[PDB]
Design a protein around this nucleic acid. Structure first.
Ligand SMILES: C[S@@+](CC[C@H](N)C(=O)[O-])C[C@H]1O[C@@H](n2cnc3c(N)ncnc32)[C@H](O)[C@@H]1O
Lengths: 227, 121, 366
RNA sequence: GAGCUUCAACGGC
RNA sequence: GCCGUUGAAGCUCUGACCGAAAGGCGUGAUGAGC
């Protein structure tokens, strides 16, 4: 009893599931592969994967009305903090075959989960690396359209600026999810986001700052433009 | 909705445990904090243990759930660490607490246990 | 001037014009694993050589270690990260690699990854417990074998016992020099030995009370020394592996207290899981197993810390604060250990900064 | 020398 | 059923405060023999 409607963002679909409630979903790029245990649904002939705002952040952002979403079919994106690939699989549905993703994940036991998945998803390169030392992935990657960063590190603002000089192509955008306590657990969140916003703006233009509650406590997702 | 909560808990229940503490905080023996709680479990006897659902790093209490089938003690979840802190008699929070001696709640401590043994299944 | 790629190493002038390019002769991921980290390999070295006889004396790479190794090799080198090269390979990759460029960037990319990552799993925490127990067993034997070599070779050259107290040095003497008459300036200074050292020695050599040794009684004292030198090497091989394997075991624990101290605690605990389940009060005093027993026995003053004493902040601070920094650290291990056991996501940088800052507190109040 | 987990005998509501 | 004096056996640092206040603190205050 689920009906799938197109969503303002290309490669993102809206679903109304049995109870009449709306949810968001991408279209499964590799039919018949469960990446994180996500609910899968079938519209006319094809699999769509519900993108749960609770297990994702890009996802919480989109449910919370994110206006700017640079990540579209065909786009190339450098994904810092890719992990098991929960959300990254979604942006791999959106990007599509004609797109490219470079995942960069610092901890090997975790990136490992993602590796066997990228066998059928030929548009993600799992790359073991430290998002702090961009140069140490230098030959692995190539200039991208967008930079997604979910890393929960204290330098993440700078981590994003450093990669942005290296890999983010002029006119492209970046997006970063900030976990307040991660930067400072002493100072007040709207103050952390203040400082992060000023820091970011020395390099970028900050065009959007979208608080992430109810799904995450004290996180916000900035989207910035590289001039 | 964390990943270390192995089952849902009702509006009540989660409320029932919370008070189960307040009547042991005077009449019985109680220990607060995730360490003293952890001790109490490997110490082989504490009668029931309580774990907040809002915790982060969400792993600091992740060990109690496995630890408690080991020592075979029942556990339950309250929704807020802070509610549980003021519950246990402290102005700060508690990621978890263990009931050492039930006191008045002996009966109450008892009934809550059996409600838990169903939905751990 | 020079940037790497998934195909070969490339050289561009100040205009972006392609000078010379050397495709990898080895497996692309194997050369890359080296080059990216900053170490220098065949095809690069063989490259800038063919470049040196060009008219190019001027070099700039994308990594600060590549530059070090290059000038320490005689080439003038500098570091500008994005530079005229990387900007060209990573800008118009099809120009170089053809339209499947991304597909290639794929084959290698995942190839380097499956090479950098340990397979499967599951006792590798108990393996680090061997490597560690092994690692410090190889210490108890290097100390025996060295005690012998000392007592032994001292029959022939007794004086050298006190002129070379640093064992690896004594041992490279016996191995490299051999018979006491093989001593002379050139070989002594290659041991890295100093000057006063090279001068003493001979002053105690040239007149010695040592017994004589035939090339037969010497070769076997050399086979002892040459063996300890194999144990020193096996030590390093045990260290490299404790390091490399904490990446799959407790990245957080490793980033927090160091690969080595963390393997210790995993060791006292009995495994990563047994270390997870521990109340940080336990982790505090791990290793103190003896001084702990006489607490619950003679009611003695409890040990403020175990193995963790190794933490710089604890052992270089006055005894005034040691106890507080003790559990201040124990707490953060408890967490790193539980993150490590359950997910393995890397939170260590938050953990550190929360700990550095707690420590200033402890310092400021005393 | 304390303390909790545990198991034959003993005192009792 | 509760309870108790126990007996060999095995396990276990402590646990609500520091601040003149501002604050910090059970996500561990305080005391303490690696
Ligand atoms: C996917 S996000 C958060 C996921 C979690 N479910 C929350 O919400 C965090 C990931 O970033 C990785 N990471 C942390 N620091 C990093 C760094 N400096 N460079 C690259 N990756 C990093 C961690 O291993 C972690 O898996």
């Amino acid at each position: 009893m689920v009906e799938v409607k197109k969503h303002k963002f290309p490669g993102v679909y809206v679903v109304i599931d049995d109870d009449g409630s709306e949810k968001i979903a991408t279209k499964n790029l590799v039919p018949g592969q469960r990446v994180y245990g996500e609910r899968v649904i079938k519209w006319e002939g094809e699999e769509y994967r519900i993108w749960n705002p609770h297990r994702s952040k890009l996802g919480a952002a989109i449910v919370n009305g994110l206006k700017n979403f640079p990540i579209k079919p065909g786009k190339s994106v450098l994904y810092l903090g890719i992990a098991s690939g929960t959300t990254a699989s979604h942006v791999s549905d959106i990007v599509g075959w004609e797109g490219k993703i470079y995942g960069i994940e610092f901890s090997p036991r975790v990136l490992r989960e993602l590796v066997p998945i990228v066998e059928e998803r030929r548009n993600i390169i799992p790359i073991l690396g430290d998002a702090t030392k961009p140069e140490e992935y230098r030959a692995l990657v190539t200039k991208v359209d967008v930079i997604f960063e979910d890393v929960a590190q204290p330098t993440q603002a700078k981590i994003l600026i450093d990669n942005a000089k290296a890999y983010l192509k002029r006119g492209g955008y970046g997006m970063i999810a900030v976990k307040s306590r991660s930067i400072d657990v002493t100072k007040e969140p709207e103050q952390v986001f203040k400082e992060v916003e000023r820091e970011l703006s020395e390099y970028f233009e900050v065009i959007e700052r979208l608080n992430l509650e109810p799904y995450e406590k004290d996180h916000a997702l900035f989207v910035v433009r590289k001039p | 909705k964390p990943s270390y909560v192995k089952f849902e808990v009702p509006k009540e229940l989660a409320e029932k445990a919370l008070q189960a503490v307040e009547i042991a905080r005077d009449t019985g023996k109680i220990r607060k904090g995730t360490n003293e709680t952890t001790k109490a479990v490997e110490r082989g006897q504490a009668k029931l243990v309580i774990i907040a659902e809002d915790v982060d790093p969400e792993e600091i209490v992740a060990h109690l759930p496995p630890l408690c089938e080991e020592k075979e003690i029942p556990y339950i979840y309250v929704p807020s660490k802070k509610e549980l802190g003021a519950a246990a008699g402290i102005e700060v929070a508690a990621a978890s607490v263990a009931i050492i001696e039930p006191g008045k709640a002996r009966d109450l401590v008892e009934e809550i246990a059996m409600k838990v043994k169903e939905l751990m299944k | 001037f020079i940037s790497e790629n998934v195909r070969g190493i490339y050289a561009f002038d100040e205009n972006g014009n392609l000078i010379e390019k050397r495709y990898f002769t080895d497996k692309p991921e194997k050369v890359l694993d080296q080059l990216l980290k900053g170490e220098i390999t065949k095809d690069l070295e063989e490259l800038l050589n063919s470049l040196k006889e060009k008219g190019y004396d001027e070099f700039v790479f994308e990594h600060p270690e590549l530059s070090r190794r290059a000038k320490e090799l005689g080439f003038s080198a500098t570091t500008e990260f994005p530079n005229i090269a990387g900007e060209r390979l990573r800008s118009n990759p099809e120009e170089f690699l053809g339209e499947n460029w991304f597909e290639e960037y794929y084959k290698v990319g995942v190839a380097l990854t499956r090479m950098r990552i340990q397979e499967q799993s599951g006792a590798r925490d108990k393996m680090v417990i061997q490597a560690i127990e092994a690692l410090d067993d190889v210490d108890k034997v290097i100390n025996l074998l060295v005690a012998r070599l000392r007592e032994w070779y001292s029959l022939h050259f007794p004086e050298l016992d006190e002129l070379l107290p640093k064992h690896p040095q004594y041992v490279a003497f016996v191995k490299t020099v051999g018979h006491r008459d093989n001593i002379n300036e050139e070989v002594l200074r290659e041991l890295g030995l100093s000057e006063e050292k090279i001068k003493k020695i001979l002053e105690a050599k040239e007149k010695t009370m040592g017994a004589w040794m035939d090339q037969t009684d010497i070769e076997v004292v050399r086979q002892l020394a040459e063996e300890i030198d194999r144990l020193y090497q096996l030590r390093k091989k045990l260290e490299d592996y404790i390091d490399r394997a904490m990446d799959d075991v407790a990245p957080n624990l490793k980033a927090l207290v160091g690969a080595k101290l963390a393997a210790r605690l995993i060791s006292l605990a009995g495994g990563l899981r047994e270390l997870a389940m521990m109340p940080s009060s336990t982790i505090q005093v791990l290793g103190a197993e003896k001084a702990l027993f006489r607490h619950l026995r003679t009611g003695a003053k409890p040990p403020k810390h175990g193995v963790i004493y190794q933490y710089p902040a604890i052992n270089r601070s006055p005894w005034w604060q040691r106890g507080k920094i003790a559990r201040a650290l124990a707490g953060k291990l408890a967490i790193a250990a539980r993150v490590d056991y359950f997910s393995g996501e890397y939170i260590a940088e938050e953990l550190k900064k929360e700990l550095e800052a707690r420590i200033r507190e402890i310092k400021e109040k005393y």
